[PDB]
Amino acid sequence: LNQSPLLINLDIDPVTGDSVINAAEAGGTVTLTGVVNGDVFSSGVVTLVINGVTYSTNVNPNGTWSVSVAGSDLSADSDRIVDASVVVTNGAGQQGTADSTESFIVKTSSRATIRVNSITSDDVVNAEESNSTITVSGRVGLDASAGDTVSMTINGTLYTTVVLANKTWSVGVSGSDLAQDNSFQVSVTGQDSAGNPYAGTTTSTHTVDTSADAGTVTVNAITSDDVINASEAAGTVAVSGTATGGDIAEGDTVTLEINGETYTTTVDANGEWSVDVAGSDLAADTAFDAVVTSSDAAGNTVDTTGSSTHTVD
Numbered sequence: 003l004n005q006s007p008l009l010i011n012l013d014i015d016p017v018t019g020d021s022v023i024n025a026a027e028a029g030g031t032v033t034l035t036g037v038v039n040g041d042v043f044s045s046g047v048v049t050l051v052i053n054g055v056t057y058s059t060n061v062n063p064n065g066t067w068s069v070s071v072a073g074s075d076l077s078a079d080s081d082r083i084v085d086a087s088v089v090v091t092n093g094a095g096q097q098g099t100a101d102s103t104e105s106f107i108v109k110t111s112s113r114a115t116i117r118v119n120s121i122t123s124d125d126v127v128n129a130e131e132s133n134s135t136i137t138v139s140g141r142v143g144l145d146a147s148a149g150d151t152v153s154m155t156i157n158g159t160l161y162t163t164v165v166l167a168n169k170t171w172s173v174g175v176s177g178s179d180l181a182q183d184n185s186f187q188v189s190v191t192g193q194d195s196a197g198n199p200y201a202g203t204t205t206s207t208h209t210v211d212t213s214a215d216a217g218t219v220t221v222n223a224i225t226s227d228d229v230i231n232a233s234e235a236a237g238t239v240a241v242s243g244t245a246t247g248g249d250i251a252e253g254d255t256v257t258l259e260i261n262g263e264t265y266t267t268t269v270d271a272n273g274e275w276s277v278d279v280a281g282s283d284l285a286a287d288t289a290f291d292a293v294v295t296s297s298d299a300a301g302n303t304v305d306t307t308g309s310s311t312h313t314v315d
């Protein structure tokens with residue numbers, strides 16, 4: 003009572019107040035604090051062990067204490083537990099000891115992912131798309147969050163948007179930038195609940211195809227001698243030719259304008275075409291073009307022209 007051991011209790015306050023050690027805290031010094039309660043005493047020594055490293059301090063007259071420790075020791079501490087002990091002394095030279103522990107959480111980074119969808123439906127920017135607004139869209143994952151910033155620089159132009167509630171994102175980009183920059187980085191940046199910044203990135207690539215390729219179109223003789231007689235002019239004449247090369251394909255439309263009249267047919271599997279024409283039209287119009295309309299897989303279109311002349315008797 004004057005000769006008895008002192009009975010005390012040792013408490014450690016939550017580490018950095020929120021019980022969480024983040025990257026910035028880990029990279030500096032941290033103040034741990036607590037109280038010694040119980041019997042009255044006139045001084046004391048608190049010993050803390052963290053990551054095998056001992057820290058020590060005094061206890062204040064009001065029973066509190068506080069000590070600077072390496073964030074790196076807290077971050078490295080294998081079980082995320084601070085071990086603590088105290089010895090105190092009173093005026094009569096009685097002493098007392100106690101122990102305590104304090105667990106904490108270490109969260110020094112987070113992971114964020116991002117993906118980017120295809121650039122238009124086929125991941126190809128065609129001629130028409132290159133003169134339009136094209137949607138660039140994607141989603142973010144892992145620790146990335148609604149409200150995060152999504153950015154990309156495309157042909158030197160910075161485009162920005164924000165992650166939506168469902169973690170998708172999209173932003174309108176000019177076709178002409180996409181026509182000129184077929185590979186770029188997209189990033190998502192933000193901050194986790196412990197305050198650590200994070201960044202995720204991905205590379206979007208696409209191809210640019212803004213033209214289809216003309217082939218070769220020919221027109222055969224207009225009848226066997228390339229001359230329209232009175233008799234042939236009275237009837238129907240089969241006008242024929244070829245259409246091959248470039249993007250010309252079976253099924254392509256062949257268009258002929260003769261004497262103000264429009265005639266059409268399609269290219270066949272041999273690369274030939276034939277169409278029935280009124281003789282009266284060929285009689286009035288001694289020269290005309292055959293025009294084949296083609297397209298490539300990107301959806302660009304192109305006209306291939308063959309020109310014809312004949313005589314009339």
Ligand SMILES: [Ca+2]
Nearest residue numbers: 018020022023
């Ligand atoms: Ca903290």
Ligand SMILES: [Ca+2]
Nearest residue numbers: 079081083084
């Ligand atoms: Ca420990």
Ligand SMILES: [Ca+2]
Nearest residue numbers: 120125207208
């Ligand atoms: Ca792509």
Ligand SMILES: [Ca+2]
Nearest residue numbers: 122124126127
């Ligand atoms: Ca496309």
Ligand SMILES: [Ca+2]
Nearest residue numbers: 183184185186
């Ligand atoms: Ca680029």
Ligand SMILES: [Ca+2]
Nearest residue numbers: 147192193194
């Ligand atoms: Ca956040």
Ligand SMILES: [Ca+2]
Nearest residue numbers: 211213214298
């Ligand atoms: Ca093409």
Ligand SMILES: [Ca+2]
Nearest residue numbers: 225227229230
């Ligand atoms: Ca003839």
Ligand SMILES: [Ca+2]
Nearest residue numbers: 287288289290
């Ligand atoms: Ca003509």
Ligand SMILES: [Ca+2]
Nearest residue numbers: 223228311312
């Ligand atoms: Ca001819």
